[PDB]
Design a protein around this ligand. Structure first.
Ligand SMILES: [Ca+2]
Ligand SMILES: [Ca+2]
Ligand SMILES: [Mg+2]
Ligand SMILES: [Mg+2]
Ligand SMILES: [Mg+2]
Ligand SMILES: [Mg+2]
Ligand SMILES: [Mg+2]
Ligand SMILES: [Mg+2]
Ligand SMILES: [Mg+2]
Ligand SMILES: [Mg+2]
Ligand SMILES: [Mg+2]
Ligand SMILES: [Mg+2]
Ligand SMILES: [Mg+2]
Ligand SMILES: [Mg+2]
Ligand SMILES: [Mg+2]
Ligand SMILES: [Mg+2]
Ligand SMILES: [Mg+2]
Ligand SMILES: [Mg+2]
Ligand SMILES: [Mg+2]
Ligand SMILES: [Mg+2]
Ligand SMILES: [Mg+2]
Ligand SMILES: [Mg+2]
Ligand SMILES: [Mg+2]
Ligand SMILES: [Mg+2]
Ligand SMILES: [Mg+2]
Ligand SMILES: [Mg+2]
Ligand SMILES: [Mg+2]
Ligand SMILES: [Mg+2]
Ligand SMILES: [Mg+2]
Ligand SMILES: [Mg+2]
Ligand SMILES: [Mg+2]
Ligand SMILES: [Mg+2]
Ligand SMILES: [Mg+2]
Ligand SMILES: [Mg+2]
Ligand SMILES: [Mg+2]
Ligand SMILES: [Mg+2]
Ligand SMILES: [Mg+2]
Ligand SMILES: [Mg+2]
Ligand SMILES: [Mg+2]
Ligand SMILES: [Mg+2]
Ligand SMILES: [Mg+2]
Ligand SMILES: [Mg+2]
Ligand SMILES: [Mg+2]
Ligand SMILES: [Mg+2]
Ligand SMILES: [Mg+2]
Ligand SMILES: [Mg+2]
Ligand SMILES: [Mg+2]
Ligand SMILES: [Mg+2]
Ligand SMILES: [Mg+2]
Ligand SMILES: [Mg+2]
Ligand SMILES: [Mg+2]
Ligand SMILES: [Mg+2]
Ligand SMILES: [Mg+2]
Ligand SMILES: [Mg+2]
Ligand SMILES: [Mg+2]
Ligand SMILES: [Mg+2]
Ligand SMILES: [Mg+2]
Ligand SMILES: [Mg+2]
Ligand SMILES: [Mg+2]
Ligand SMILES: [Mg+2]
Ligand SMILES: [Mg+2]
Ligand SMILES: [Mg+2]
Ligand SMILES: [Mg+2]
Ligand SMILES: [Mg+2]
Ligand SMILES: [Mg+2]
Ligand SMILES: [Mg+2]
Ligand SMILES: [Mg+2]
Ligand SMILES: [Mg+2]
Ligand SMILES: [Mg+2]
Ligand SMILES: [Mg+2]
Ligand SMILES: [Mg+2]
Ligand SMILES: [Mg+2]
Ligand SMILES: [Mg+2]
Ligand SMILES: [Mg+2]
Ligand SMILES: [Mg+2]
Ligand SMILES: [Mg+2]
Ligand SMILES: [Mg+2]
Ligand SMILES: [Mg+2]
Ligand SMILES: [Mg+2]
Ligand SMILES: [Mg+2]
Ligand SMILES: [Mg+2]
Ligand SMILES: [Mg+2]
Ligand SMILES: [Mg+2]
Ligand SMILES: [Mg+2]
Ligand SMILES: [Mg+2]
Ligand SMILES: [Mg+2]
Ligand SMILES: [Mg+2]
Ligand SMILES: [Mg+2]
Ligand SMILES: [Mg+2]
Ligand SMILES: [Mg+2]
Ligand SMILES: [Mg+2]
Ligand SMILES: [Mg+2]
Ligand SMILES: [Mg+2]
Ligand SMILES: [Mg+2]
Ligand SMILES: [Mg+2]
Ligand SMILES: [Mg+2]
Ligand SMILES: [Mg+2]
Ligand SMILES: [Mg+2]
Ligand SMILES: [Mg+2]
Ligand SMILES: [Mg+2]
Ligand SMILES: [Mg+2]
Ligand SMILES: [Mg+2]
Ligand SMILES: [Mg+2]
Ligand SMILES: [Mg+2]
Ligand SMILES: [Mg+2]
Lengths: 117, 63, 144, 137
RNA sequence: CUUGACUGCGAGACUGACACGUCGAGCAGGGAGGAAACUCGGGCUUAGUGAACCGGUGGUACCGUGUGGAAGGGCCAUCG
RNA sequence: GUAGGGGAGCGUUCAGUCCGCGGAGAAGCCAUACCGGAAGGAGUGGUGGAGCCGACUGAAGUGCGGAUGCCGGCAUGAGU
RNA sequence: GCGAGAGCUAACUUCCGUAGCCGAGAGGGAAACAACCCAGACCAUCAGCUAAGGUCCCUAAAUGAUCGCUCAGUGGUUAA
RNA sequence: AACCGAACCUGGAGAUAGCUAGUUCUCCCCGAAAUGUAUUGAGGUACAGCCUCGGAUGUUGACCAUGUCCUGUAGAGCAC
RNA sequence: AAGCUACACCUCAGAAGGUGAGAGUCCUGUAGGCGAACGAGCCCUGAGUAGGUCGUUGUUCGUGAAACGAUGACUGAAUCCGCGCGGACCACCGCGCAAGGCUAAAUACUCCCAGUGACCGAUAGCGCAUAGUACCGUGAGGGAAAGGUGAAAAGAACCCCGGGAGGGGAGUGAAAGAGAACCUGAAACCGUGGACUUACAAGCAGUCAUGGCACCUUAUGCGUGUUAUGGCGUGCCUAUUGAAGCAUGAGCCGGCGACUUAGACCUGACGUGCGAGCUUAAGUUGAAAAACGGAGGCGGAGC
RNA sequence: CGAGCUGGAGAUACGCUUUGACUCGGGGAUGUCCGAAUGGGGAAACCCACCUCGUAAGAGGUAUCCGCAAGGAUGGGAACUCAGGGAACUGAAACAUCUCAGUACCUGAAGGAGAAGAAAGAGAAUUCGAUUCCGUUAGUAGCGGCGAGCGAACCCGGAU
């Protein structure tokens, strides 16, 4: 019994090719560059996911001291003074509190400063 | 098929026993010898160790 | 069926190549193709006699009809074998294997789509196992 | 029984090694190692300096007796067994050779076996228990 | 003064991938020196060396092809 | 986690047995946002116009990105 | 890196010893950078703590507090 | 008879190739070596050494402490 | 209509092929039966020898203790109380009659024919779905690609633009979404139209994040397509101490393309049968099937 | 056999056929020229003759080697058989003996087969009983730079 490759290879190739949407040029049309681009793209997808965690970390922080200094203290002497205010621990995305309710972020500034005295 | 390597047979390598490979003791054949009388005698029958698997298939039918 | 040496070992600028008759060519020569061979091997005797015994045994859950003679077929005509079987629950919702001794009696129905004949000897751990029932008939082989 | 439902004993067939055929295992270089004389093959059980050549003490012939140790011989219950009955009753497979017996633990009751020759100390323990042994005159 | 510059052995260990190499108490046959205990199986020790194959010389009586021998071969010792 | 050893598996053709499907339309092809831990598998629609899926067992010419690999088609250089 | 020979107390030299790394090791730091510093990645999270290394703006985080020092851009290229 | 230190064709013939290149489905578990000897040996092999699988045994393994013996480097010294 | 359905029927015949799609009962056939004038076919018993020396050689026979047969050169016997051999050679003991011829069957092969296939099905299979052609060579010699309207030609009268080629209609046909560049018709490649986009931009071509604009058939969502902008980001393989490497390979896509087979062979793991015992080989007979066959092989005694 | 037929051929005209076509089975008879080629020559398929037949047109003969003579041979065959010749790459991890292997190849002869064949044998039982083939003996006995490696037979079981 002979068992030629037919239908198998086209199906595999077409699944690779379909992963290529708006890939530029022969990235979208030739199988070999499509598959090769996907190897490097693997690298990027995994690394980036882990990194995106750390990137939103950064955006968080960068808003929080901007509001903090608007109230006359930096990030450092703030997220300290909430933690030194101990039970105050809300921590996760204080960014949004600073970015939408300033009546609240002002009270948190007063709390941190009271804790540092 | 499968030959025995007849270089194994009347040469040292008795196959015999609990499956282990005896061989002889070698130096001072009939090449010249002054040398000691307690070595000229201690050349009777040795038995090798970590090569046996090679020796066996030289002669697995025990010729 | 092809030739020679093809051209320049070095210097043509084309790839290396040697003759037109190799598997890397789309010409000819399968590398590791089928060649004629035999697959038959002497299976040990104890196991095939145990096999047919187990096969007959497997039909004692629900199956295996009479080993004896039961031939009221008008010399040899299928419609009358169909009637004989139809009185035994062999209406042919189930394929059935028959074994016997009289050419006159198996000849009755070599045709019918359910049954197939085999003479005494020439039984088959596969045949009796692949039909849905066994009309053992021929009592001689059945008893010793 | 259902041929659909036949099933070989688990563990009685294992699959072949498909060497090549992926980076899911056994990639590129096959089972093989990389370079070296491992490639389209040859050369046997030979080290290609000096293969442990030890000297050769030699004598060509041999011819050995067929064995009947008498430890089975005593539980035998049947006694006075001439040995041409024995090859054609059990034991002593060899047609090309001659038969011999030998001491194995006990002897016990009487018997009389006509073997081609036997150990002298069988006569030390077959003659006791009132038994003859016929070397083939 | 004389040969222990011995025959049959080798419990145990050092050392080496092997194959080789090293040391050896003690047992037998027979010696040697000593009054004895005892020490002798080469040299204070560590270099002075070659596997295997094929053959020469001396013993032994194992093999020896129908049998009885012999040719030839094996074993022990040695030489190249 | 590289050579390497081990484990469990996906898909292709052929064969045996079963369950079936098909001109009110089969394989193949085409699109797709569903499913499975992966190999993959289904749903629906478009095309096609005569065969074919699923399950269990068996046997393999059984899985390609490379080989200045082969055959074929088509591009770049260029309206040069 | 440490301990040595060879070398010119040369070399991203060569040859041994020794530990660790790369080899097969992703992640953070060292501008970039196999080997150096921190640390060994089963999968997911728009949650929290630290290591090396950092906190003027590129660029996450003290234009931090207290004593001094250097007015050379020393910092940000050797010596007699 | 458009490539002559030995023509062309067909055959042995799938010459041989310790040398180059290539060797394709999937997830899971473990995970090396570039050392030592020998080699008409040095980019090749054989045996060790390091990996894995299965069986047996069953803490015999690992660091660390205490006890004990072995050593002639660092340093130092001038008694050879 | 052969499929579905409902009622029947044959079967020594339900093997198969054809027939507008899948037919036991429509055709050809099948089981079975018949079947030709000429037709093919089961006192003797071997001499230039036997034997020998020189060179050699064949069988396991490589000058080895090397017999025996074999001839190239030179020699050269004996008769039935005789002749050859039994692996230097001798005696004994055995086997056999050389130098004359013929001889069926069991064996091999496959140009040719039949049947069959866990054989191919258009880059496979023979080189050829036919061709030793075309084509290449002075020659010997080498050597291609090869396919498909439709059930049936009913193979497109007539009209329209065009010298034609080509097309558009009308017809036929189930279909012309089959029209003779005639089954399906992938991909690379070339175009036309549309959505979203792009003319201060530095770029292994992605990836992740967020805004914009479209869209709504596994689909109003943790959607789909496409964008702008930020962060991050050194092709793939091979070969390597070390590859984005200015080191190898590769224009692209399609298809072809590499760990196999064999043998009573060795050695292990797993599984089955029978177990102190297990098993057959060649073959014989039966084959829509397998039984028989102990010759022989492995354990069982070692040194 | 019992109505079609007129090759593939698909294109018409022309016919033929139930006093049997066409097709199938079996015989006859024609059979240009070359080709073993063979009357002589030759660059195959073309040139040139002679002798009897003899009315012509046409027919028949004319090579060599075997044999008195009949009658035979010459050439051609995919592979298979036997014979006369007889390699080398290769393996031996180099190479001389050795292997590859009496393999490939060339040549001769023959057939449906061929070869071989009726014991001055095998062989160690005073067993056997022409040859060939298969199984096993057995990789045993042996051969061998005693290296690489090569490798019987008898007994026994079968085909005949
Ligand atoms: Ca222009
Ligand atoms: Ca230009
Ligand atoms: Mg990234
Ligand atoms: Mg935080
Ligand atoms: Mg022995
Ligand atoms: Mg090029
Ligand atoms: Mg072919
Ligand atoms: Mg197999
Ligand atoms: Mg296998
Ligand atoms: Mg694996
Ligand atoms: Mg490689
Ligand atoms: Mg090769
Ligand atoms: Mg070999
Ligand atoms: Mg050497
Ligand atoms: Mg036995
Ligand atoms: Mg004294
Ligand atoms: Mg002593
Ligand atoms: Mg001698
Ligand atoms: Mg003798
Ligand atoms: Mg002698
Ligand atoms: Mg449909
Ligand atoms: Mg799909
Ligand atoms: Mg149709
Ligand atoms: Mg293949
Ligand atoms: Mg690859
Ligand atoms: Mg390619
Ligand atoms: Mg091309
Ligand atoms: Mg120096
Ligand atoms: Mg260096
Ligand atoms: Mg490496
Ligand atoms: Mg590491
Ligand atoms: Mg790193
Ligand atoms: Mg880094
Ligand atoms: Mg960085
Ligand atoms: Mg730097
Ligand atoms: Mg560096
Ligand atoms: Mg790295
Ligand atoms: Mg923190
Ligand atoms: Mg710190
Ligand atoms: Mg900042
Ligand atoms: Mg400051
Ligand atoms: Mg020229
Ligand atoms: Mg030319
Ligand atoms: Mg040349
Ligand atoms: Mg080649
Ligand atoms: Mg060859
Ligand atoms: Mg060579
Ligand atoms: Mg691990
Ligand atoms: Mg050494
Ligand atoms: Mg090396
Ligand atoms: Mg090893
Ligand atoms: Mg283990
Ligand atoms: Mg221990
Ligand atoms: Mg411990
Ligand atoms: Mg010092
Ligand atoms: Mg039909
Ligand atoms: Mg019907
Ligand atoms: Mg005569
Ligand atoms: Mg002669
Ligand atoms: Mg001679
Ligand atoms: Mg010789
Ligand atoms: Mg003689
Ligand atoms: Mg002779
Ligand atoms: Mg003799
Ligand atoms: Mg097929
Ligand atoms: Mg073809
Ligand atoms: Mg084609
Ligand atoms: Mg051809
Ligand atoms: Mg020409
Ligand atoms: Mg021509
Ligand atoms: Mg057609
Ligand atoms: Mg046209
Ligand atoms: Mg027209
Ligand atoms: Mg119509
Ligand atoms: Mg159209
Ligand atoms: Mg169409
Ligand atoms: Mg046209
Ligand atoms: Mg069709
Ligand atoms: Mg088409
Ligand atoms: Mg356009
Ligand atoms: Mg456009
Ligand atoms: Mg500008
Ligand atoms: Mg702009
Ligand atoms: Mg630009
Ligand atoms: Mg972007
Ligand atoms: Mg390099
Ligand atoms: Mg690099
Ligand atoms: Mg480049
Ligand atoms: Mg490159
Ligand atoms: Mg290179
Ligand atoms: Mg290039
Ligand atoms: Mg066997
Ligand atoms: Mg054989
Ligand atoms: Mg007719
Ligand atoms: Mg016609
Ligand atoms: Mg002529
Ligand atoms: Mg002629
Ligand atoms: Mg003539
Ligand atoms: Mg040569
Ligand atoms: Mg060689
Ligand atoms: Mg030679
Ligand atoms: Mg041949
Ligand atoms: Mg010939
Ligand atoms: Mg001939
Ligand atoms: Mg016989």
């Amino acid at each position: 019994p002979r068992a030629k490759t037919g239908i198998v290879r086209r199906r595999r190739h077409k699944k690779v090719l379909k992963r290529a949407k708006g890939f530029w040029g022969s990235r979208s049309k030739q199988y070999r560059n499509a598959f090769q681009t996907l190897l490097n793209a693997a690298t990027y997808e995994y690394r980036d996911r882990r990194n995106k965690k750390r990137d939103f970390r950064r955006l968080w922080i960068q808003r929080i001291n901007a509001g903090a200094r608007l109230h006359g203290m930096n990030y450092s002497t703030f997220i300290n003074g909430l933690k030194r205010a101990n039970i105050d621990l809300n921590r996760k995305v204080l960014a949004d509190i600073a970015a939408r309710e300033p009546e609240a972020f002002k009270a948190l500034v007063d709390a941190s400063r009271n804790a540092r005295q | 098929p499968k030959m025995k390597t007849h270089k194994m047979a009347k040469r040292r390598i008795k196959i015999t026993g609990t499956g282990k490979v005896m061989a002889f003791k070698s130096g001072k054949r009939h090449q010249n010898t002054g040398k000691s009388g307690d070595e000229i005698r201690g050349k009777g029958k040795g038995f090798v160790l970590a090569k046996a698997e090679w020796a066996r298939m030289k002669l697995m039918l025990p010729r | 069926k092809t030739g020679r040496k093809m051209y320049g070992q070095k210097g043509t600028g084309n790839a290396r190549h040697g003759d037109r008759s190799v598997p890397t060519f789309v010409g000819g020569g399968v590398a590791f193709g089928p060649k004629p061979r035999s697959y038959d091997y002497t299976l040990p005797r104890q196991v095939r006699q145990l096999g047919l015994a187990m096969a007959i045994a497997s039909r004692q859950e629900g199956g295996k009809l009479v080993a004896v003679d039961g031939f009221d077929i008008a010399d040899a005509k299928t419609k009358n074998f169909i009637s004989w079987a139809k009185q035994n629950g062999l209406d042919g919702t189930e394929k059935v294997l028959l074994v016997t001794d009289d050419e006159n009696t198996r000849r009755a129905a070599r045709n019918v789509s359910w049954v197939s004949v085999l003479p005494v000897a020439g039984v088959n751990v596969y045949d009796i196992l692949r039909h849905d029932r066994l009309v053992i008939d021929a009592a001689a082989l059945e008893i010793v | 029984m259902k041929l659909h439902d036949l099933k070989p004993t688990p563990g009685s067939r294992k699959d072949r090694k498909r060497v090549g055929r992926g980076p899911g295992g056994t990639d590129k270089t096959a089972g093989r190692g990389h370079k070296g004389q491992k490639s389209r093959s040859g050369a046997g059980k030979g080290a290609f300096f000096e293969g442990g050549r030890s000297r050769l003490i030699a004598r060509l012939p041999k011819r050995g007796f067929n064995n009947v140790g008498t430890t089975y011989e005593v539980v035998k219950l049947s006694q006075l067994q001439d040995l041409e009955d024995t090859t054609f009753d059990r034991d002593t497979l060899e047609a090309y050779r001659l038969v011999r017996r030998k001491n194995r633990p006990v002897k016990l009751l009487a018997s009389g076996e006509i073997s081609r020759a036997v150990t002298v100390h069988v006569d030390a323990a077959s003659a006791a228990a009132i038994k003859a042994v016929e070397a083939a005159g």
